[PDB]
Amino acid sequence: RQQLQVLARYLKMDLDNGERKFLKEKDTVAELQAQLDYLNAELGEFFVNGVATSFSRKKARTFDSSWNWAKQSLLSLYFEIIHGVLKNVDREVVSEAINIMNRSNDALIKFMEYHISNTDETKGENYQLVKTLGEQLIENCKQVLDVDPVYKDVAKPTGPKTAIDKNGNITYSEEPREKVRKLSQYVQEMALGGPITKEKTVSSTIPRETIPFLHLRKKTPAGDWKYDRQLSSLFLDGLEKAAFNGVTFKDKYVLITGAGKGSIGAEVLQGLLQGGAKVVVTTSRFSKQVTDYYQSIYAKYGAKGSTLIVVPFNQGSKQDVEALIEFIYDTEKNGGLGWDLDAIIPFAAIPEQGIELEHIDSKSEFAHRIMLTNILRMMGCVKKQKSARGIETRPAQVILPMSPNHGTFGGDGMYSESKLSLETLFNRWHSESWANQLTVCGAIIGWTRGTGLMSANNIIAEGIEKMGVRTFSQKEMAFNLLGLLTPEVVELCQKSPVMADLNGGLQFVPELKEFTAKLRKELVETSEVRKAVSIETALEHKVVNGNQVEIQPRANIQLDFPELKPYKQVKQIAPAELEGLLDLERVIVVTGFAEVGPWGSARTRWEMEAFGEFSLEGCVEMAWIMGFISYHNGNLKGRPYTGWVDSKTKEPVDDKDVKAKYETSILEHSGIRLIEPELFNGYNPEKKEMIQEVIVEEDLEPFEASKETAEQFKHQHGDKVDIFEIPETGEYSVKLLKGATLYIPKALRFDRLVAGQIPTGWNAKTYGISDDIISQVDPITLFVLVSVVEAFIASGITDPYEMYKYVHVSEVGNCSGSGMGGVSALRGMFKDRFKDEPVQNDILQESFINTMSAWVNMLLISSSGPIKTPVGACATSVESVDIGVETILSGKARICIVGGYDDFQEEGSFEFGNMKATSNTLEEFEHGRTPAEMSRPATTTRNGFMEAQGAGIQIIMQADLALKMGVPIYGIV
């Protein structure tokens, strides 16, 4: 240590510099942590975590292809009617026809006319019905070609209904209302009002001295808002027109927040899209599920000229608010929308329950921010954007969600403070300088059954209505609100702020909190009493008098051979002249097919493709493929057992329980997903190994090696290495010298992280392939072997030698091929051998594209027929079919195996990424895309293909031979 110190002092090297700097840095860390701790103590964890940003421009999702969704809707309706699913023109059908009219154009008319003129009304009553309904629809659509799309709700209005069973079970239902069965009748009911609201167009019917259930108010000189008959007449006439003729929102740009599923905002949004609006809709839970929900909404309701933009948004973050408005107003070249808003609908809110005055804390402060402060900031941001561009004649109507009850119920934190504070805007519109950029429309929203803010009260709505008051469904309230976007109310708002009372006379019920509590306790008591009495009566019966078998489904997997009709029907399908016209030795048919892929077999892949989820048979097949379950027949824990057991624990599993036990893991480890290194020999795209050549600057420390190895080193390096025998042992010391070449491993981050992979747990041993084969061949070969065996099962041929009872051994071909063959064997030869890893000596044969077919013949088929292996990159399978058909028609074979196969490995993925053929996964993440949405053919944002792996096989043969053999025929090539 003393010698080291002397040297350090001579060299002027401070050995304690690093520790000094570290201690200073640790002091800095403590200071910053104290500041953060103080902010967390002042604001609370909920607020601090809740102001985290969510919005980014790259995550915006655009939906505008209504030109395509209209034809999809038409076809869905057409076939549902042909299949008898829709027997009558109910309200859903009328709504669908309205949405089709909203997207009508000349091309759509041609589409409908073609499909109706070509409907054979003779094929039963359903075809005549579809023809008649289609003819009416075409006539209607012809009228509205040049007409603006309209929002027009045709649903049957529903009222609340609570019932208490014999055992005191409480159920709530939304029953249709007896006297109101249209929205026009609803508007008439609203205009009439009721006894409780008592002190030509529909407005003619408003009785003298009674307040309509929906009305507008006018501010008096003293500054109080009182019911105004003329303004309310305007509003109600607008509503009447909307109910009858519908209302257009063409050329209206709208921003709406808080319109998630199950909200009033969702109903407002669908109304807006039906009328042709351009809508930006925010969401605090951006996910695949939410984006799919909005895509389906747009596909259903998006009228011609309408657009929907879905963005993630945290209304609780002021940076999010500013960035969202900036994005809306920025030019498209600058990455924005280039819009100018005509309306803002800030309905975002968060629930505050059980928060009384003394509990007001972090959460209530954050909710207050969302529901009031950042709403004012959003108004301000829009005002600044409009003024920076000198826009003075295009004001944005702000629809404020106001409440009729301020502090009346209690326990809601700062909800009532927020709501009451919004009312200052009525006066600030007049006292400040933003009235040309924004208008104020206050909507006092009434009891709306079904929301996140009122759901818990559905059960007393019936009694509340018994008081003579009106509660609203979310559809009704959305219709009320959309009434405030008509041209007349819009002009009214530009004159001066409007206040709309949509409360249905609830303000006339005195002591509302106590009344509703009494209703609730009445119901709860009745329920509890009845339940308790029933339990006690049952127990008394069971003691005085003393003391159905259900069947669980078991999976029954079918092979799904084609259904064969009676000769009469099948004769009806093809021309009568076809009999005996065709040489059936020249007709090629597919008699079986199979595949090994990311969704398992062809059966499970088809279930996923067509229906989006697994049946019981599909779930059991996927569980068995992935090795989750295995069959057992014998004693299990002593008792005999026959059935499925969990492969790991060996516990019995019922078929009915397979979904619950396994489905989630099956779906997590199937299809397109993050690359799993265990499936690709440890390959991890996040840490990709490379080697870098470095010239040694100083001699290395000697290391030991055998004589042969040492001589190899000497041969490589010449005089830049010294090798010396060790007399004691016979080994050698190896000393690299200055100037010698070395290779230092380094790691790289690759940006392709997702692939379509065969389900985790897939194993050729499950299908019956011995491990000598498994250790011999390349993995692609196992995919092919399983696929060929399954394809023959689909043909009903369990023993391939049965083929030779009908044909000679020179007449069974294999024309299947591959783009690249055994790429893992190629890796062996080119890399593993270069590093002196153990590589089997015949590795080279296992890489050939035609070796897969060689193994198929050597293990299963044993034919001496044609063997033509195509290589056609991504068109290999189609080339294979072409060749097999040519081979059969040339008379060289009567049966052929066709198809294709390829694997996925590290080098190919890297090279596809270098060519920019595949989608960059980091970029996909930047756009909010999950692995299950990265493959989106034909969409606006598509940018690269998703790589997968597996095999597909078909058996083809002459139709004459197929008939003779009695194999199923799935199609004619």
Partner 1 sequence: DKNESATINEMMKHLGRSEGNPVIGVFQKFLTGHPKGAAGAWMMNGALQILNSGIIPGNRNADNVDKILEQFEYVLYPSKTLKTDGVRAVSITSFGFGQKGGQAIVVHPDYLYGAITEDRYNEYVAKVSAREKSAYKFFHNGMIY
Ligand X SMILES: NC(=O)C1=CN([C@@H]2O[C@H](COP(=O)(O)OP(=O)(O)OC[C@H]3O[C@@H](n4cnc5c(N)ncnc54)[C@H](OP(=O)(O)O)[C@@H]3O)[C@@H](O)[C@H]2O)C=CC1
> Contacts with a second copy in 563-602 (CB under 8 A)?
none
Count residues binding ligand X (CB under 6 A).
27
Whole-Å CA distances, 352 to 8, 193, 282, 514: 66, 33, 21, 20
Is 853 among the residues that bind partner 1 (CB under 8 A)?
A: yes
- Answer for the pair 141, 237: CB distance below 8 angstroms, yes or no: no
CA distance 916 to 859: 40
Site for a second copy in 49-68 (CB under 8 A): 51
Is 445 among the residues that bind ligand X (CB under 6 A)?
A: yes
Structure tokens, 405: 């009850």
Site for a second copy in 390-429 (CB under 8 A): 406-411, 414, 416-418, 420-421, 423-428
DSSP 8-state secondary structure symbol assigned to residue 821: -
Which residue in 673, 717, 894, 929 binds a second copy (CB under 8 A)?
A: 717
Structure tokens, 489: 């109310």
CB 909 to a second copy: min, Å? 5
Is 840 among the residues that bind partner 1 (CB under 8 A)?
A: no
DSSP 8-state secondary structure symbol assigned to residue 148: P
Of the pair 488, 751, the CB lying nearest a second copy is at 751
Non-local CB neighbours of 337 within 8 Å, separated by 6+ positions: 280, 309, 327, 328, 329, 330
Q: Which of 136, 131, 138 is nearest to 78 (CA)?
A: 131
CB 329 to partner 1: min, Å? 23
CB 131 to a second copy: min, Å? 43
Of the pair 380, 677, the CB lying nearest ligand X is at 380
Structure tokens, 104: 């009508």
Structure tokens, 407: 């502090």
In the numeric block, the tokens 């024309």 are attached to 815
**Contact stretch for a second copy (CB under 8 A) within 80-88, 286-294, 470-478, 821-829:** 821-829
69 binds, among partner 1, a second copy, ligand X, none (CB under 5 to 8 A by kind): partner 1
Q: Which of 792, 746, 828 is nearest to 955 (CA)?
A: 792
CB 445 to partner 1: min, Å? 32
- Answer for the pair 628, 635: CB distance below 8 angstroms, yes or no: no
Non-local CB neighbours of 287 within 8 Å, separated by 6+ positions: 930
Is 857 among the residues that bind partner 1 (CB under 8 A)?
A: yes
CB 452 to ligand X: min, Å? 3
Residues in contact with ligand X, shown as a per-residue x/- string from 345 to 364 under the rule CB under 6 A: --xxxx--------------
Annotated catalytic residue, options 381, 815, 874, 896: 874
Is 845 among the residues that bind a second copy (CB under 8 A)?
A: yes
- Answer for the pair 918, 928: CB distance below 8 angstroms, yes or no: no
Q: Is 387 exposed, middle or buried (0-12, 13-18, 19+ CB in 10 A)?
A: middle
Question: Is 449 in a helix, a strand, or coil?
Answer: strand
Site for partner 1 in 790-829 (CB under 8 A): 793, 796, 798, 817-820
532 binds, among partner 1, a second copy, ligand X, none (CB under 5 to 8 A by kind): none
Which residue in 203, 291, 397, 403 binds ligand X (CB under 6 A)?
A: 403
Which residue in 58, 394, 541, 746 binds a second copy (CB under 8 A)?
A: 746
Residue 141 annotated as catalytic: no
Site for partner 1 in 205-234 (CB under 8 A): none
CB 931 to partner 1: min, Å? 10
Q: Is 279 exposed, middle or buried (0-12, 13-18, 19+ CB in 10 A)?
A: buried
Q: Which of 648, 625, 658 is nearest to 761 (CA)?
A: 625
Is 503 among the residues that bind ligand X (CB under 6 A)?
A: no
Q: Which helix (H) or strand (E) holds 445?
A: strand 438-445
CB 195 to ligand X: min, Å? 24
Is 436 among the residues that bind a second copy (CB under 8 A)?
A: no
Site for partner 1 in 643-682 (CB under 8 A): 671-672
Question: Is 567 in a helix, a strand, or coil?
Answer: helix
Non-local CB neighbours of 580 within 8 Å, separated by 6+ positions: none
CB 447 to partner 1: min, Å? 36
Is 264 among the residues that bind partner 1 (CB under 8 A)?
A: no
Which residue in 125, 251, 525, 911 binds a second copy (CB under 8 A)?
A: 911
The amino acid at 842:
D
Is 819 among the residues that bind a second copy (CB under 8 A)?
A: yes
CA distance 150 to 143: 14
Is 629 among the residues that bind partner 1 (CB under 8 A)?
A: no
Structure tokens, 585: 């030795």
Is 353 among the residues that bind a second copy (CB under 8 A)?
A: no
Is 103 among the residues that bind a second copy (CB under 8 A)?
A: no
905 binds, among ligand X, partner 1, a second copy, none (CB under 5 to 8 A by kind): a second copy
**Contact stretch for a second copy (CB under 8 A) within 55-63, 265-273, 592-600, 754-762:** 754-762
- Answer for the pair 917, 746: CB distance below 8 angstroms, yes or no: no
Give CA torsion, residues 418, 423, 425, 428, to 10 deg: -120
Sign of the dihedral defined by the CA atoms of residues 499, 500, 503, 505, in that order: positive
Is 270 among the residues that bind ligand X (CB under 6 A)?
A: no
Structure tokens, 687: 């840490």
Question: Is 103 in a helix, a strand, or coil?
Answer: coil
Q: Is 933 exposed, middle or buried (0-12, 13-18, 19+ CB in 10 A)?
A: middle
- Answer for the pair 585, 950: CB distance below 8 angstroms, yes or no: no
Question: Is 155 in a helix, a strand, or coil?
Answer: coil
CB 358 to ligand X: min, Å? 21
Residues in contact with a second copy, shown as a per-residue x/- string from 446 to 485 under the rule CB under 8 A: ----------------------------------------
CB 324 to partner 1: min, Å? 21
CB 61 to partner 1: min, Å? 7
Whole-Å CA distances, 517 to 406, 450, 466, 662: 17, 19, 15, 45
Site for ligand X in 298-327 (CB under 6 A): 313-316
Is 471 among the residues that bind ligand X (CB under 6 A)?
A: no
Site for a second copy in 500-539 (CB under 8 A): 513
Query: Within 10 Å of residue 446's Cβ, how many Cβ atoms?
Result: 24
Residues in contact with a second copy, shown as a per-residue x/- string from 258 to 297 under the rule CB under 8 A: ----------------------------------------
**Contact stretch for partner 1 (CB under 8 A) within 72-80, 251-259, 340-348, 539-547:** 72-80
CA distance 81 to 83: 5
Residues in contact with a second copy, shown as a per-residue x/- string from 848 to 887 under the rule CB under 8 A: xxxx---x---x------xxxxxxxx-----x--xx--xx
Residue length of the chain: 973
- Beta-bridged to residue 253, according to DSSP, are 278
The amino acid at 939:
T
CA distance 39 to 45: 9
**Contact stretch for partner 1 (CB under 8 A) within 277-285, 722-730, 745-753, 878-886:** 878-886
- Answer for the pair 328, 320: CB distance below 8 angstroms, yes or no: no
Which residue in 946, 955, 957, 961 binds partner 1 (CB under 8 A)?
A: 946
CB 615 to partner 1: min, Å? 14
> Which sequence positions are flagged as catalytic?
874
Residues of the shown chain interacting with ligand X in the complex, contacts defined by CB under 6 A:
257-258, 260, 263-265, 282-285, 313-316, 347-350, 370, 401, 403, 445, 448, 451-454
